[PDB]
């Protein structure tokens, strides 16, 4: 099992112009180890489709060309203003990735819950995501 974690911040989140189905992309990161597989995270600030229009969507994508099908479990969390993990969603098992394949959660968090300052999920209008992946 190859375990790797990535912390990424989206600045000025309440200012994001992406309409439904449009994507904010993280930097490309790496699972290190043997194969140096490359990955990215993709965020739909206003959902992926009309079914998810009230939600932020979050997906893990395999960027590089693997030598074979990759199986990975993943967990996505939001880091709150105090720095603690909250609002986690995790895959119940490993999912199968090829180059260009994404897996994630179309309904990761409700937008209005996310934007409410009383919930402490956007300190200084920054959304910090914490992605943990185990390639099995």
């Amino acid at each position: 099992v190859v375990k790797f974690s990535y912390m990424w911040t989206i600045n000025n989140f309440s200012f994001c112009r992406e309409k439904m189905g449009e994507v904010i992309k993280s930097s490309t990161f790496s699972s290190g180890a043997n194969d140096k597989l490359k990955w990215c995270l993709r965020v739909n600030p206003k959902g992926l489709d009309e079914e998810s229009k009230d939600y932020l969507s979050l997906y893990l994508l395999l960027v590089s060309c693997p030598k074979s099908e990759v199986r990975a479990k993943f967990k996505f969390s939001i880091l709150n203003a105090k720095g603690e993990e909250t609002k986690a969603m995790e895959s119940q098992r490993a999912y199968r990735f090829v180059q260009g394949k994404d897996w994630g959660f179309k309904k990761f968090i409700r937008r209005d819950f996310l934007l409410d300052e009383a919930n402490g999920l956007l300190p200084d209008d920054k959304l910090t995501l914490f992605c943990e992946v185990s390639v099995v």
């Binding site: 394949k101 994404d102 897996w103 959660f105």
Partner: peptide
């Protein structure tokens, strides 16, 4: 349950 945007 995770979902994908792909075949």
């Amino acid at each position: 349950k995770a979902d994908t945007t792909t075949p």
